Amino acid sequence: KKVQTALKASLEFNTFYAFYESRCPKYIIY
Amino acid sequence: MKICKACSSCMVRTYVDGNIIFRCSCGESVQGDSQNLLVSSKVYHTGEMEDKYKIFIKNAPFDPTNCQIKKDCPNCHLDYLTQICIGSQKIIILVCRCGYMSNRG
Amino acid sequence: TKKNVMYPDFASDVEWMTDFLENHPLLQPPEDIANWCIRLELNKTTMILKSISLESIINSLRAKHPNTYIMHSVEN
Ligand SMILES: [Zn+2]
Ligand SMILES: [Zn+2]
Numbered sequence: 001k002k003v004q005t006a007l008k009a010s011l012e013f014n015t016f017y018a019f020y021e022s023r024c025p026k027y028i029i030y
Numbered sequence: 031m032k033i034c035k036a037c038s039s040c041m042v043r044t045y046v047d048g049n050i051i052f053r054c055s056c057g058e059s060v061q062g063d064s065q066n067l068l069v070s071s072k073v074y075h076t077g078e079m080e081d082k083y084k085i086f087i088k089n090a091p092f093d094p095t096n097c098q099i100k101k102d103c104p105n106c107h108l109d110y111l112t113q114i115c116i117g118s119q120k121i122i123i124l125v126c127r128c129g130y131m132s133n134r135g
Numbered sequence: 136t137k138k139n140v141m142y143p144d145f146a147s148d149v150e151w152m153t154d155f156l157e158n159h160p161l162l163q164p165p166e167d168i169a170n171w172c173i174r175l176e177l178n179k180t181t182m183i184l185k186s187i188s189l190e191s192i193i194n195s196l197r198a199k200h201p202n203t204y205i206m207h208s209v210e211n
Contacts, residue, residue: 022186048170064143074178 091127
């Protein structure tokens with residue numbers, strides 16, 4: 001359970017950082 | 031399409047001068063109002079799943095060669111469901127023989 | 136801006152057209168404007184994706200084709 005939840009959270013964070021590398025809602029290591 | 035009323039032939043557009051009049055080869059002219067004033071367009075949206083695969087998506091639950099996954103259909107509660115993956119965007123669509131379409135299509 | 140008929144699909148452009156005219160009164164439709172037009176809808180997702188500003192688009196277009204007259208709406 002811990003591995004799965006860490007993996008899903010990290011993947012969500014990865015996608016979020018990938019989208020907002022320069023953009024604003026309204027940085028490589030994490 | 032503008033067809034000549036008398037002889038049912040294709041009528042050219044002839045964009046003159048402030049208005050548009052459709053002229054046939056037999057001379058008939060039928061003028062133009064508002065909706066005739068579009069010349070050409072090319073919309074940018076790389077999507078044809080709504081019509082290109084409409085027949086395919088409808089027929090998919092009956093296709094024996096389609097991949098199935100172990101999920102319950104919200105409408106009829108079969109425990110298996112055929113899975114479609116369409117296009118470059120790899121859109122995943124879940125369909126069933128009962129008509130369920132999973133919010134896509 | 137007399138009345139003029141447009142394509143009734145894009146007929147509601149006059150309300151923002153007047154907004155453009157009052158907000159950009161340095162430039163007005165030139166006397167040589169022909170009976171031909173191009174309506175272009177910007178991809179907001181791409182211009183926010185690559186950080187392209189609307190002013191940049193319009194000034195580049197009007198500097199590259201003064202032979203053509205361009206009108207821009209408010210977008211931010
Ligand atoms: Zn005819
Ligand atoms: Zn079903």
